Amino acid sequence: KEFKKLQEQRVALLVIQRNLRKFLTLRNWLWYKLYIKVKPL
Amino acid sequence: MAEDPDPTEYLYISMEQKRKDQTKPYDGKKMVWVADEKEGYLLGLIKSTQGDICTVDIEGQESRQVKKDLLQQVNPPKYEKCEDMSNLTYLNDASVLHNLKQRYYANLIYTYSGLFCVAINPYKRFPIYTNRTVQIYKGRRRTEVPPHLFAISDGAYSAMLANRENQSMLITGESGAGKTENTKKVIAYYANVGAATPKPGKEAPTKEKKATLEDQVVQTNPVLEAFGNAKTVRNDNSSRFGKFIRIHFGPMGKLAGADIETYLLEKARVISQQTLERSYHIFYQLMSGGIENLKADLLLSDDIYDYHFVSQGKIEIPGVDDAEELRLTDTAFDILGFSHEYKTDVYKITASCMHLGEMKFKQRPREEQAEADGTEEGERVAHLLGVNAADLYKNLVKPKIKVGNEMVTQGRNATQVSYSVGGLAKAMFDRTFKWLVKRLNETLDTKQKRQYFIGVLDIAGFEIFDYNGFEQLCINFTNEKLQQFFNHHMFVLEQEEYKREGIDWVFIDFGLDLAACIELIEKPMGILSILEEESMFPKATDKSFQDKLNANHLGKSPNFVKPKPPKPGQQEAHFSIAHYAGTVPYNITGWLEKNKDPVNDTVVDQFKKGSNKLVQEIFEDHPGLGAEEKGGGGKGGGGRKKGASFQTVSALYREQLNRLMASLHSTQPHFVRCIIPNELKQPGVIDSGLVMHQLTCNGVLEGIRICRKGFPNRMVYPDFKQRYTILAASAVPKGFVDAKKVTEAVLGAIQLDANDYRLGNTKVFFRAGVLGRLEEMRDDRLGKIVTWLQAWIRWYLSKKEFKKLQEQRVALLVIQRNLRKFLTLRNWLWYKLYIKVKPL
Amino acid sequence: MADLKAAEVEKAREHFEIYDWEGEGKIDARDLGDLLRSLDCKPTLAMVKKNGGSDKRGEKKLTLEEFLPIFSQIKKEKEVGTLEDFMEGLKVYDKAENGTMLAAELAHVLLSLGERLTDIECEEIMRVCDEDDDGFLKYEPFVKTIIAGPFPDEGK
Amino acid sequence: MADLKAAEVEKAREHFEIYDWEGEGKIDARDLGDLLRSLDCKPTLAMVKKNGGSDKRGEKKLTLEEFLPIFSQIKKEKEVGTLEDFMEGLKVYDKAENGTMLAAELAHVLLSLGERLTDIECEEIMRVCDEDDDGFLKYEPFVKTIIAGPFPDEGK
Amino acid sequence: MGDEEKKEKKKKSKKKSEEEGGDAAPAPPPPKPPSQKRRAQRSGSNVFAMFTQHQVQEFKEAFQLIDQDKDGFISKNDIRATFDSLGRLCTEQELDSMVAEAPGPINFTMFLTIFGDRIAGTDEEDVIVNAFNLFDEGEGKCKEETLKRSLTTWGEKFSQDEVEEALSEAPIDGNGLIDIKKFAQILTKGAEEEGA
């Protein structure tokens, strides 16, 4: 019954693995973020 | 029209006379009805009258000096070729007798006898299937709707829906009327009030697709009938048992379901037979009707006299088979939503109750004990239970009789042994049927609409043979209590309802008692019986049974035939008890053995037990009925309470019996007093002698004294004002107001003749005659305004329910007026959006 | 009554324009039925089927150019009906002394008179207050929403 | 069940990517038992050791190839939904069979014999069944409740 | 109205605001009584101040089409002509919209009562649910994506460019632009891309 929580995690594991690679890719390719705070112009 | 209703469903009148003012100066007097000495009423002429005494001759060929009040003056043409018999005010047996004869001749069956109807029941079925029926019992005239049981059910629905408080329709009767056959036409009104959704292309056809609640309410009566109905030859299709049906009706009258309980069932119509009793209808169904699949497995013959509890062939009554009646009921399981499994499992247990018969006097040894040289006979029982041929043939022959509380045996010879084979069958059939209703009742607890019911009570069977069972006796102790709801509703609750409503009538109650010594509470009824509460032990004396009878049943009962006991040994005593039907010679012995059980609790209980537990649910949840707490002692069960108790389910049925009876006591009466017309159960045959007898015990004088103002039509005074339509005005109401003497003005304004009305400011009250046919002529006269509303409703429907040509168009054109310029009009001179735009 | 006059031509163009939706000026066969009814010729279902109409799904498309040499025949023998007649008529049934009408009861009296109401239309009379307690109409907003038509066009 | 089905292999390829947190494959030892339990095979801790698998953390871990002979041994033996010694393993304090045993001896006999599990579950075998004040609590329905199951079939 | 007829009474109906040149004739016939004119034009009247903003710049974006001259007071139809075809985006038929957002020549002085006359204009304020809403069989608010739908399946036919442009230029609120906002468009919610 709990394996249900884990069964929707089978596709989710495939998303965090590409995203961890993009944690370093977009840190060599910055100017791809900027969202509301006090720094925008 | 031409002032006769149009035949579609069968037995509709085509009149000669009209029940209107002409008929009123005919009344008596020249010819009268004198009572025969051979039972019945026939036609006599007054030859000389000596004042208060008269000499009235008979076609019996006697000359008789009679007393005024006895000789009924001849009933006038109001009951000859009229829809009428609602206007009855004429006393004693004969008044009714003549009129029901002329009812057959007038192409009808059921008729009003005032509010308290008489039903003469042969059983015929008019088609219900037509899209014609579902307009007819969707409310129409009082002779488009016939004076059959559909009428009363219209005027209950119309009543209930105007005054917003509850009614009942309570059928009494005796053996020679099959209560249930009547009830399915009450339900066929209800079940065909229905209409269905519009079709989009303007299609008039639709309906006979709606709705499984109505279907369910019907279908249950065949299921209940196959088990509980057997037959007689005085009473073809004899329900021998008792069932209480609460039918629930909607906002539009559409059936919502039916909470159906079961009272008792026989254990005496399959333990042996009396001459010209048939066993339970289902056996023969199963046999003749069977498909090749079940025929193999269940090991069935279509031959009879290869049994002994299944003997007697087909009995002639219209519209009943055994074979086609199988398919009806098999479908009637399917429709209920019952399990496809449990049908065959139940059939396996059901069919052994045939197979069992033809076994007697098995002392031939195989193992140095009473068994039998049979094989096939008992193998066709054996396989269907699981248990082998030896388990069977051992345990049949004699019961383990609790003597003290330990176990002894008696010597038992051929008949004794016979009767004990029949034990095993009656314990199975009672117990399966008892599980069975209650698990089907669950599904029928969906309502989802208005919470108004009528409760229809059907407790029938009685029987007049040398032997009836103790089971039938406890059923007839209800029958006594039915005659008390008659007393209580014919005097009392009828005119309490007349008073409340404020309808005219001098409020007078006459004395009659048919019982009053019985109480509708459990505790008095369950001092009885010593053939219950001590019989499972040899301490039970038939003596004390009668003594406790004579206190509790006799004192205020009048048609009760006293016990005269044969002092030696165990009774062959006879007594009888009040009912509409005759004296019964009882046999008192054997009642004993049946609640020491010829085939025990234990022996049955182990076919109940399973081997995956799925088997168990089908018969039991687990306390009692197939699983046992053990020990000796107790009453009832099963194996609560306790163990091999030797069943006394009749005591449990004091308790519950209080619970059915008292609520039904307080409900306002619609009544049907079902009379035996003839034994053969056939239209155009009626017997005088039977009807003469049934009506003297059903207090017919008193029963017309209040019901001389009987109204079994009750509707809405607006509704009836509107069906004639009133376009003339000087002072004519359109108001919701009294009908005391006002009904004569909203008729006579434009045309119409008037003979029947009664006061009403909520429910308006009618009797049959003058209304109905004059309202069919308003189809012919009403052109103009009426029919143009109807054409306008066609223009209404069509505009709304095309589903695209409706309010779609107006919007779509304004939608377009934006679409032609959508690039422009989604902005203006000054672009103001700088807030939340996909690139800006 | 009325003969062929500008006012009728408008009445017919107006009902037709409601009855399309395609924007192609084509209405189906069945719609001849209720067009003629709205025009106040008071046809029966017979008169519809006479003009090759239907009470089933359409079979073919009609332009107004077909419809009008049917219609100029239909106009002969007709009553345009009054309004006040249906009010006076329906006042006869009451249920509060205010001209209020239980829904079932209003279907039933129509059913059992005239050419006789179909299964479907009694469901439509009933429809408003369906399957609850049954269910009260009032004569004045009843007749009025019917004749007015439910959105012939509005400015809101 | 009583034999491997083709869909239980197709189920196990999908559920392989769950067990390894990367979305790859490698069955965790406690999640060894969760795969057998989502494929209708629910051995004991002493039957797991016979098949050579696992159902708890710290035991051998395997790959999905290696999972097939382990899974196939349970099919040959009990616990795939078979009946014997479940609701046949209860009752011995009653020499009566009414399909009931004592309340007190239906919650501290799973705790004084058995592999021994939670007091909450000891309270579910008492909750599913009927209650009377005669001291008679049924044993045989809590087991059939398990036959009904969250999924009678292959979990998902 | 026959086949032929509803071609004619686009050009012949034409009940203000619908008396505009169109894309291939203006709006599809309203039925014979003139109730529906009110959904053809709505008009309010609140004036809003000029030079109070700093998105006031917008008037300079529009300017050139509505002021050929460097101090304006050009010809009076030229607002009603040119601005139609690429001012507040492409495709002409902005005739009566323009004659109802300008009450004569527009210039920087005149700007108070055009900014104000935006809120009078056509299908401005007088917010009502039922107008578009009754299409989808009265079920939920009738928004953008069903209008696009309708233009390629039913109704009279008009230039497809304007619609595909209009969806793309949507702000997005998530249920698109409801009837409320289709009227109330002056106060929040406008367009993107080329022009004015």
Author numbering:
A (entry chain A): 800 to 840
B (entry chain B): 1 to 840
C (entry chain D), D (entry chain C): 1 to 156
E (entry chain F): 1 to 196
Task: Give sentences from the paper.
More recently, with improvements in EM techniques, higher resolution studies have homed in on one particular kind of structure for the myosin head arrays in relaxed muscles.
Here we deal with the myosin filament structures in vertebrate striated (i.e., fish skeletal and human cardiac) muscles and insect flight (Lethocerus) muscles. Turning now to insect flight muscle, the same story appears to hold true there. Using further analysis of the low-angle X-ray diffraction data from bony fish muscle and insect flight muscle it has been demonstrated that the normal resting state of in both intact muscles in the published X-ray diffraction experiments is probably not the IHM, super-relaxed state that has been seen in 3D single particle reconstructions from electron microscopy.
